[PDB]
Amino acid sequence: DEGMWLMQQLGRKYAQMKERGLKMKEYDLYNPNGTSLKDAVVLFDGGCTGEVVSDRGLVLTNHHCGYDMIQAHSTLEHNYLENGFWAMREADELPNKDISVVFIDKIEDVTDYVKKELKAIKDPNSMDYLSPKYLQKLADKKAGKNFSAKNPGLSVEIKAFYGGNLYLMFTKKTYTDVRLVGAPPSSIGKFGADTDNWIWPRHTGDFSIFRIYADKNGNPAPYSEDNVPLKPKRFFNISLGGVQENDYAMIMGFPGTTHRYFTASEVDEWKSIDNDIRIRMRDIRQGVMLREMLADPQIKIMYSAKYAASQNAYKRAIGANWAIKTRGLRQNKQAMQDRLIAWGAKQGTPRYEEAVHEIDATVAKRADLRRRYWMIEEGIIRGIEFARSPIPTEARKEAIDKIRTRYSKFANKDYSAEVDKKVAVAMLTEYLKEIPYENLPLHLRLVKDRFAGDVQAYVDDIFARSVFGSEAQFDAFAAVPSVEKLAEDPMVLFASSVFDEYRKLYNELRPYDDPILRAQRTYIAGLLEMDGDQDQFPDANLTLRFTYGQVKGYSPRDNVYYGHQTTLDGVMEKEDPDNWEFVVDPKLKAVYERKDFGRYADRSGRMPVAFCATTHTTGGNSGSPVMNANGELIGLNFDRNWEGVGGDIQYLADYQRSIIVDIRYVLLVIDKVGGCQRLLDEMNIVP
């Protein structure tokens, strides 16, 4: 069901959640002065979510969340990334540098305090009401000086909500000794990772396991061997009961951003500039890279990761545009604003209509600038590798060595000048079609002026004459440098020129953000006064939220249905030993052959892998705990389907799903692949 809800909003949603199957008492989910299930949810390393699952501080998160830590502890000799890692006793758990887990100890509405303090600011158009600096000053003031000394490991922050109409103060408890406990092999943690990115059905065992360490009274402490596991105030019980179609499910985590209060003019802008340009430009770049990778197996090895990276936001854009085209996104936002405008007229209050028209005006006014910026960003800054070639400055020589370092990083083991030329020719062709001469970065005027419109000639010239055009040409330069040659170097001139245009566009565009922000404060205030907050969630902003719904599949298209649950049978169907992403771990294969599923499979002997649910999630919900009607953990959220990515603007009940690793599968992999029984023994596994 729709919405990423504040914890303060639980009372307002509780009836709707019970109608969907919630059985918990409200107080047990969240409450302000006691212990609640909220106390088992953590912000894992500043972006991802995780969850406490034992009375000795075991934390579950996604493999993709744990990846960097697993990587860091890997050596080609103990390659934990590839083989999995299973500590067989607490003493074998691996400390990590610059990691943290954050608990949300307390939440308090401070809207009256902040609004009163804002009256001091004379200028009605000051943006201090959204300023992190300003808000931190208010938080610090409110908590007292010495707060910190009287509160081991606690800090405070104030955040804006509802466009500046509501403020909460959070009290955070931060732990920095968080040790790696367990991880599956990558073939399990990243199964289908690229090819199945954004896809349901999904077959990835995307998990990893950490443990919070602390002082002997459970306070935060920097890493020390005298530290001991945290004995947390609350942890999740783990359900063995599984899921069935239509079961209630809920998620708590830290979603980053949403745009629920877009005007119709902002939807049209997101379609026709940001998405349309990203889709066009990336389809060009990718098409060239594909052709090259298919022609040459060394190019495949060099460019596969850059290709997959480009594909990630491309696939998102595709999905968003599908939603705008087929699911009525614009009309939804149009109806929202027409309702408020007609109401405002009844109240004799034209300020809401003025706000919408101000947003409309600003969006109209920036259109050509924003189009220029997205063209350069997608076409060149991200599009063309040689845009990010070295730009100098700067008797010696030390500077040559400094340039050499940047050059080697540019033209590294994954870079092909020949691939980059082909990509640049195609990208610059489209770029020059769309951007008129008068608005080109200056160096690109040379295509018309010096090369007679021949982009291939132009790009061939940059590489022929640049000191960065090849290692040979770099070495000839240093060796025998020239100040001179460098000042005129066509690659340096290209790179300088495009980054100059990028910067100027950025700087001209930035001022347009503020009138929109100011107008949205008024717009959202309107919407709330008129209809209330019960069916109007605040946009995500990296803070703790809950969402609820049901375990359920969907129909992507006529006569096709995806169910709610994948199985280990589906892993085996996808097996491909010659594709790294569809390798099946030999222990798991052996498990499937023997049906050695223990107590983790369903009564018909099918072993679950993942499931999907109608919860409303976005980026920042990776790793989030998925709870059943009684608050027990039934899975770990890891993705969302491409059909649903338009959900950041308008929730799509019939298409949008969260993609979730089944906790039964997590347990299976712990048990049968890891052989880490002690982790099972320390959890409270319930029927």
Next chain:
Amino acid sequence: DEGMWLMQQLGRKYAQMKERGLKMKEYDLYNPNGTSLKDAVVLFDGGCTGEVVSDRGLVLTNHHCGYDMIQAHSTLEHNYLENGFWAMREADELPNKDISVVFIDKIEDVTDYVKKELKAIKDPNSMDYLSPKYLQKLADKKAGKNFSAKNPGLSVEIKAFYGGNLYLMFTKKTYTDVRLVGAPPSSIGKFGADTDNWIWPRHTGDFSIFRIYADKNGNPAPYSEDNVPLKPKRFFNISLGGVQENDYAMIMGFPGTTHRYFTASEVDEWKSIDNDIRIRMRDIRQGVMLREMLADPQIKIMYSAKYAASQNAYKRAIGANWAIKTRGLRQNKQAMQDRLIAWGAKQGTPRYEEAVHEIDATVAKRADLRRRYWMIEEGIIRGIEFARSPIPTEARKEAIDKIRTRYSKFANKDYSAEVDKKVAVAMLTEYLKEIPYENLPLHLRLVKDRFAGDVQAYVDDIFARSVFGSEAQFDAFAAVPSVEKLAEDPMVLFASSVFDEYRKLYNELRPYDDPILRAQRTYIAGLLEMDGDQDQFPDANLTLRFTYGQVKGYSPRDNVYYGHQTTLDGVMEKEDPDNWEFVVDPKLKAVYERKDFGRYADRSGRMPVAFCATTHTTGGNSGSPVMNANGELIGLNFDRNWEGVGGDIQYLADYQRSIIVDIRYVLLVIDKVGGCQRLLDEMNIVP
């Protein structure tokens, strides 16, 4: 349900069909001396099936069955292929040249007659028992001379069944005045034709409509304006009732071939030679053609149809190999033979085991020859266009003009020498890898002997020096011919050489067919004696058969389900104006926008397009009538899904489907797109 059943087998199947929902009395479906629904089924133009659907001789078949006739009547001015054709009165229906519809008037078991006549042949290894010549002589003898003069439009044929263990005599009634009445536009008749070939879900309105004309007493007659519509003895009533999941369905038509009595050694041969080679070689050829078509829009236009043609049997091979790998085809055939062998031992009869071992021996013995033949056939004869360049023979000049005609047909508006070179280089690379020097067509030895292993050099030389290497080079030749030059021409020598090897392989392989055939007579006799015919259908052989089952979807893979029914919503989802195969006709679009579905949609207002069923069909079932439990027409068969193509060897209950145009959609397109009300009025449309 499994099987393509003889009409004589209806009694044996009738209980199983009733358990699936059949409500008809047996006699009304088929009977030997009266009128039955069998009398409404026709063999349409010697391969396809069709059905009589009015009392004035209206015949429904597939668009793909009618295509050639529609094409022939099209001029660029009246382009019926593109716009549809709808005759608005009988006088406007278009006669066709060299067309026929065949009714199966009578069927008679003649097994005793044929076996008695075969005793005359002294040689136990004579293949007269399967000879069309020999069998026609027996048919002619049995019917009497003068049969024909005493029986307007009737002819007789005898066919072998069950490997020569059963013989039927058919009495055929042939009509040759069959006029085009109606056809949808191609965008409807071929919607998704290439991209959705072998695919369910499917959205194609694949139909066309003819009318049988005859003399005034309804006898066959060649085309004349005095001819009148046939008043047939039986026609299908058309149901408006629709279909629902699990409804009974049955089909009658003329399936071509199946291989239900393969030994396990024959399955392994079909996998490892015929399919594996076809998949490998076509994936090469297609990969090259794709790369070229994507690079160049004129090449796309020239090669798209050749690419789609290659893809047709490729996709089939893929599907068959999937079935051999995942669905147990070999083990099924292994179990069949082990059952018979163990039974034969109990009966003191070793001849069944000897038969299986003889088939095994023959398959082992031909393995390298058959591998060579498939390599040359897939790699070169079909693989490389210049294999089919002109080979001469032959004061004038007339012969030059004859060569010019063949050359122009070779290097036509769809041929690119540059594409053909690239394909040849890749195909010949794989070919030379697989076939050792000693077994090469002689000219290809030159790659090692004259070009130092360089296939590109070799192919470049053929085109450089051949008189067929370009139009320029052809014109220089004739102009100034040379006998001489032609005798040495490297393309002519290549073409001669490969066809010589092809022919020699073919001739050496042919004798191996007979011992297998002879052994299969014995093998099948065994199987029938042991278990009877109730669950052992005779292989298809182009004769009239029935099949039964239910309206039902399937799960292609874990967590995905395809339903039983597509809708017009699915057509609209696939719309793409810039792809000829996904163009939506403007009248049909307008129908969908207005929901102008008349009485043809379901009670929820969704308009059906196609459905699928568990019937057992193959090539020759195109156009076949699909009947409900009461014998009413509910659809027209048009394809089968790729998952099910292994069904020619072993029926796959959980995957194999027939793909069927919903008759409700046929009516809709007649009515709302064609505007051909009189065709509706002449049918007997029942609730």
